[PDB]
């Protein structure tokens, strides 16, 4: 199973994952790849912010699904 993590700046990271992987595990992989701390990452799928303790299967994320990645909105 691969999924795509897509930024709004046109960069897509391809990750190898399992349905039982948690969002924490996915964020850890994004940190390894791009150096973004997990607490700064916002992942969105199905219009939902994905939470660290839930699994890909919890959100019904499928093979070759794309997840949006943006940063946490700071500075307000």
CA distance linking residue 71 with residue 55, whole number of Å: 20
Distance CA 56, CA 76 (A): 31
Residue 18 binds which of Cl ion, Ca ion, none (CB < 5-8 A, kind-dependent): Ca ion
Q: Tell whether residue 65 is a contact of Cl ion (CB under 5 A).
A: yes
Of residues 28-57, those binding Cl ion (CB under 5 A)? none
Nearest residue to 1 via CA among 41, 55, 40, 52: 55
21 binds, options Cl ion, Ca ion, none, Cβ within 5 to 8 A by partner type: Ca ion
Write out the residues near Ca ion by the rule CB under 5 A: 18, 21
**Binding positions for Cl ion, rule: CB under 5 A:** 65
């Amino acid at each position: 199973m691969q999924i795509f993590v897509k930024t709004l700046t046109g960069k897509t990271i391809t990750l190898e994952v399992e349905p039982s992987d948690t969002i924490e595990n996915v964020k850890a992989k994004i940190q390894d790849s791009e150096g973004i701390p997990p607490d700064q990452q916002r992942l969105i799928f199905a219009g939902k912010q994905l939470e660290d303790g839930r699994t890909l299967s919890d959100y019904n994320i499928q093979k070759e699904s794309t997840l949006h990645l943006v940063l946490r909105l700071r500075g307000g």
